[PDB]
Amino acid sequence: PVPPENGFIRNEKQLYLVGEDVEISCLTGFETVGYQYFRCLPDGTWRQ
């Protein structure tokens, strides 16, 4: 997926399985506020 500002996606892989959720963290110096999770939809889009 295309990460939000400051990116910093952990455990970067080429393809994610359907239903698997990856947590995103904020790049220094920032802090995660809200719900930071990207879950794979059945189609190629993301929840964001």
């Binding site: 990116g7 910093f8 952990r10 455990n11 970067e12 892989k13 080429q14 399985l17 359907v18 239903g19 698997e20 959720d21 947590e23 963290s25 790049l27 220094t28 809200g34 719900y35 930071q36 999770y37 879950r39 794979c40 939809l41 059945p42």
Partner: protein
Amino acid sequence: TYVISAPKIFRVGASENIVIQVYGYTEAFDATISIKSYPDKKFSYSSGHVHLSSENKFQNSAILTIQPKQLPGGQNPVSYVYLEVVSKHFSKSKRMPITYDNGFLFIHTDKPVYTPDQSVKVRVYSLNDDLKPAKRETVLTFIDPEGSEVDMVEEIDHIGIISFPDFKIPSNPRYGMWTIKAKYKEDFSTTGTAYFEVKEYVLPHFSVSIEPEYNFIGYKNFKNFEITIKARYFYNKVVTEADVYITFGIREDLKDDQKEMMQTAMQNTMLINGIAQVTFDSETAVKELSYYSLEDLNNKYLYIAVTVIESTGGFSEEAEIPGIKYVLSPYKLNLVATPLFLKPGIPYPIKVQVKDSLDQLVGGVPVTLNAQTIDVNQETSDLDPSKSVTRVDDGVASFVLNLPSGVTVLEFNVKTDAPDLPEENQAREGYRAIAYSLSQSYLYIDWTDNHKALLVGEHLNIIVTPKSPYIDKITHYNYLILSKGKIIHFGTREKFSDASYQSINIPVTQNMVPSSRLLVYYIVTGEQTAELVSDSVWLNIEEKCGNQLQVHLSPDADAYSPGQTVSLNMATGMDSWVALAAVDSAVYGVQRGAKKPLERVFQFLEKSDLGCGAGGGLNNANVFHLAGLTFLTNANADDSQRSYFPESWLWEVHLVPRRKQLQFALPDSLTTWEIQGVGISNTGICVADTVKAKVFKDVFLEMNIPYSVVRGEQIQLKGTVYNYRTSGMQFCVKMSAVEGICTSESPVIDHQGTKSSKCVRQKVEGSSSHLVTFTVLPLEIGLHNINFSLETWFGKEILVKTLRVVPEGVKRESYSGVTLDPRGIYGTISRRKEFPYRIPLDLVPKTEIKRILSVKGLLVGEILSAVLSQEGINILTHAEAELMSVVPVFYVFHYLETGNHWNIFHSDPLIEKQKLKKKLKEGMLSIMSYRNADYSYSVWKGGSASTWLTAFALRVLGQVNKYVEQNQNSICNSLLWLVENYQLDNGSFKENSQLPVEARENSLYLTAFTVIGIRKAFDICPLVKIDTALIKADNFLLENTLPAQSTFTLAISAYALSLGDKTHPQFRSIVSALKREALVKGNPPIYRFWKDNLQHGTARMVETTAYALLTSLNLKDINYVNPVIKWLSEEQRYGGGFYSTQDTINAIEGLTEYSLLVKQLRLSMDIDVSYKHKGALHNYKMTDKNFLGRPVEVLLNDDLIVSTGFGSGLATVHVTTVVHKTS
């Protein structure tokens, strides 16, 4: 000869009968067959023995089994099989592929439609290949329609019908098609898949079936297309009269649900006697709404909507059809149960089938074919065409063609013939059939299953013919009948000169009910070499149960009264376990018909057949591979190439003798109950025919009771009472509502609960109904029971209905979620997390916030390899290279302590540990001998000072710090010396002991080396000046690593920066550049490495590969580390490294970090979520086997705190907040 016939794919834990045949001799010699693994040398699963004699005619078959003797773990668990034969005259070996695919899983659910907050009754039918119960453990997982797993449950099977606990729907369901998978959870295959949709099945008023006159609209149906819309009740009675509204539309594809539509009709027709039919022309629709009027232009589905409302009472039911697309090309043709091969001289039947656009057979379409019979040697002639029609009941067109004995192949072009189908738009499919040989011998079996399909218990005769054999005198006839990939029986006959063709009698058994195959092969004795010929044809018979399970109620009547006590009697041939399920006939939503619960016990069982096609083919190898077998002979080889009443009820499992009867009570419902039972015994599985239990009542009342009634708004509450008596009557209906719902009576009469409606007795004609409405407005959250009293002649009855309401607004927000880190892998330690409970200002009055919590178990690291050996024996104790000799001992001891593996050697681990400690002490004395008076570190007598060896010794001392001891004062001043002298003001580092960009490259190399050393030595001596030096050096490395200079320098800088801050922007840019500069092999990449020289004791890239491996291990990415581990395990190094041990210790540290991170992912977390000021809600026990968690609802309003103990692993917790907010 020694022809061995065996199945192509063996099944683990199954009795695979292996037969052997001998050409015949005057002496009777024994034979022996065994099952060996990939080691030849040295393993053996089982060993079977047979006996040969004149009575058995030198053929015998012994069953073989494959048990879980395979090596645990490994890169491949199967190592399929090696098959050997031990015989006096012959001995041969051959490999054969196997598969753990054994048994079958039949998941039976009580209902296809589920509502929120409803129990899930489900059972799994475990089976073997021999139809036995095969008592085995089974795990069951649930998958959300979005693709995420929900919950897993395991249970041991003792009876044979796996009973599972009732699952519960979470507070926030996800509507859609769910997924259910089942596995045996230890070592097996054949995962079963079941589907069920969660929707609102509150009440279907009457089933509306749309049966068009023709499946798809053609040319003749373009001008006039008549469609039949019939609506019928669920208790087998048609609807008397109802208003039917028809709605048409055009859709481009089945995926698009919303499309424009006429806007012209809106046709109003009346249902008569439960059947209605209307004529709809496509010309008006294509002219008015489609914006273009031509059948060639529009190739897309046609959506039709039907809304049926009753004129005598307020009710509504809807149905729909996916679509009917106008296709220029006619329907497609295909062949089924028709071998695409030729037999010379014998009439070859041709069975072709015509299917529509979407997987459905077509009937009544005349078809013809053109065939050309070609000669083997010279010119050919055209065979006379034949035309026939396809039957609607059979669905397959039958053709027969007789060909001469000198034909090799044939080609037939089957085309369709219809008055409307033109020649340009026609359906034609060409095919070719190739006949069977070096010895010119052939074989054939007849009647092509056109009996049609046979039963069990009657003997069948089959004619065989050895046309043109190698020699007129044939020794014996050999034929084998197989089923489910196993040999059930082996036949044998003798050949006499009485006739040219002999008929063989084959008895049919109960084990062959789903399907079967038979192959007839005969061997001949050649003067130089032998050659055998075989042939096979499909075997299709009927489907008769072995248990013969039939269900029948003791009272025999067309209709049953509600609440009548009924008895059900089971009748079986042998002792078997039954599984009864009383499923309502109304639970079947529209849902594209809601086909059937299972409807398939033998059709899904047919998948056990290994081979495909009907039978017959090329030379013996190809035909045996197509039939699903692999032969072993000398002649030829084989190439692998509450009441009342909720549904459902009666979920029980009871033991059933030859005659068993149980007693229960019928529920109160107007719909017909469909009972179904499945039997499990040693003979096999059998599903009973669905018996419809009709529950009928003369006078009853039913209402709409709508779903998700929004609170605060009134409803219509339309309903009608049915009168089926011949004589008329007057009815009185009053309503009683519990506190509190606004009623329009004002007041109630007489009691406080009983509310009089001031009913006026209205006449109702025979076989008619009357409309009854009530205006009510809910005031409280559901569910509330509302009473409906019906005072009428011929008895009276009261019905109770439940009403559920839903708040106005609905807003779901996750808003929270964290990943629990036991040992602090990613960043800081995260074990306890508090989720505060807040109430938004948009909360609807009298609304309770609901929260759901669960865990997922992200992933587990791979166990690819952890290898280290021969270092202790080769180089343990064996002038300036004493450091080079003693340094790797520290890293070897560190790896041994991390991996916790000492049992590989026969010696005691304590003695080896003490010897390693003594060697570490010797190495510490040696590294102390290399310390000069200026506290610096030198190589040769201390003549010149070198920073490289100084940082190397600092790394060694930092490694020692973790085990025994090191003086801090001797390290702090040693680091201060470097910070004061060898640290440039820019952040660079250099050494005193000794292409313009090469100077900068060496400077960055020395800087990264010093950064690594100071970071390794910093944890023991924290100082502000050392931190300032680290900051300056990190700034230098981040500023000067922008250009791509060298792979080795880039990797060492990336590692030096990863030892410090791992989430820096420029550090992540450098990591991305290094990943772009990475070299891979394969897709997906199996090996990942880095090369210094571009387009280039000779292996110099090992250093940069080890540095990049350490950098990736600092990022905790197992998927990215695994290929580098595969590369460093075995490759072209040989090796193959420098200095040494500049790279040797780096690779040892990389393997150590890999093993440590694999040990980090154990998932031993013990999650105990509790409230801040109240008791604990739930506790999760996470293990490797159970990596998922069950959703738990949060009702009580309090701060929720999730915490765990020490634990080991990595798991993330998810908690969402469902709060109704106005809106």
